[PDB]
């Protein structure tokens, strides 16, 4: 499953040639965290930045039990500076040098399980429909892989 994440994250990064790809997973209370990353050589890994560069707290998704994702909606942002985010949100994005990004839902069964994010640093992006569609397909495949990893867990407890 780590294998799966690594595999998925590297694929998205190479297919989109973006700076960073992240996998987010929700906890039962809709808190969550980034559990996997694929990142280009030029940037420091997320966990390392988190040990040194503090952020504004962000409980939005938790307070809203998944927000737009829960309704199968995605976020596609060509330019974060132009998007109209709250100041704290934009400040967080800017802390990670994120200038354009995509975030899509990952569903495991009919349950919102997490998110798949793709980030471009330093310059805006004109995202294309096929890039978004491809990310959704990869997110669906990830969801299936997780769903079946679960199924196989349930199987091996039951013997
Ligand atoms: C300012 C911070 C207010 C706020 C705004 C806000 N945030 C989101 C959505 C997201 N915020 C995050 C951020 C994190 N996830 C993490 O694991 C970490 C630690 C490194 C951070 C900083 C993420 C992943 C999301 C989902 C993707 C996105 O960037 O939008 C929203 C929803 C925006 C929308 O329209 O969908 C909003 C409004 N959060 C707060 O708590 C402050 C009041
Ligand atoms: O739209 S929702 O009700 O999910 C939540 C609300 O926080 C919207 N975020 C704005 C949307 C437009 C881009 C800037 C950020
Ligand atoms: Na949040
Ligand atoms: Na969002
Ligand atoms: Na915002
Ligand atoms: Na299945």
Q: Taking the mean position of all CA atoms in its chain, how far away is CA 24?
A: 5
Kindly provide the resolution of this structure in angstroms, with one decimal: 2.1
Cα dist from 105 to 34, 67, 88, whole Å: 13, 10, 23
First-last CA distance in the chain? 21
How is residue 82 written in tokens? Answer: 């132009």
Per domain, the residue ranges of the chain are 1-159
Length of the chain: 159
Sheet with 111-121, edge to edge strand ranges:
32-39, 20-26, 111-121, 98-108, 75-77
Instruction: Say how many C-beta atoms besides its own lie within 10 A of residue 30's C-beta.
Output: 17
Element (H, E) at 60: helix 60-63
DSSP assignments along 83-129, one per residue: TT--HHHHHHHHHTTEEEEEEEEEEETTEEEEEEEEEEESS-----H
Residue 33 Cβ contacting ligand 1 at under 6 Å? yes
Ligand-binding annotation for 82, yes or no, is no
How is residue 132 written in tokens? Answer: 């978004």
Residue range 1-159, CATH number: 3.30.450.40
DSSP assignments along 129-157, one per residue: HHHHHHHHHHHHHHHHHHHHHHHHHHHHH
Give the residue among 88, 64, 65, 2 at the shortest CA–CA distance from 38.
2
Beta-strand pair 98-108/75-77 = antiparallel
68 C-alpha vs ligand 4 centroid, how far in Å?
Answer: 7
């Amino acid at each position: 499953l780590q294998n799966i994440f690594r595999a998925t994250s590297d694929e998205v990064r190479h297919l989109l040639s973006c700076d960073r790809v992240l996998v987010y997973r929700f906890n039962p209370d809709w808190s969550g965290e980034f559990i996997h990353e694929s990142v280009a050589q030029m940037w420091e890994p997320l966990k390392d930045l988190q040990n040194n560069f503090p952020l504004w707290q962000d409980t939005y998704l938790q307070e809203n039990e998944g927000g737009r994702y829960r309704n199968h909606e995605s976020l596609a942002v060509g330019d974060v500076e132009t998007a109209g985010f709250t100041d704290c949100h934009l400040d967080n994005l800017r802390r990670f040098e994120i200038r354009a990004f995509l975030t899509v839902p990952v569903f495991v069964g009919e349950q919102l399980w997490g998110l798949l994010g793709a980030y471009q640093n330093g310059a805006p992006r004109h995202w294309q429909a096929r890039e978004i569609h491809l990310l959704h397909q990869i997110a669906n495949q990830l969801g299936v892989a997780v769903y079946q990893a679960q199924l196989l867990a349930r199987f091996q407890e039951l013997e």
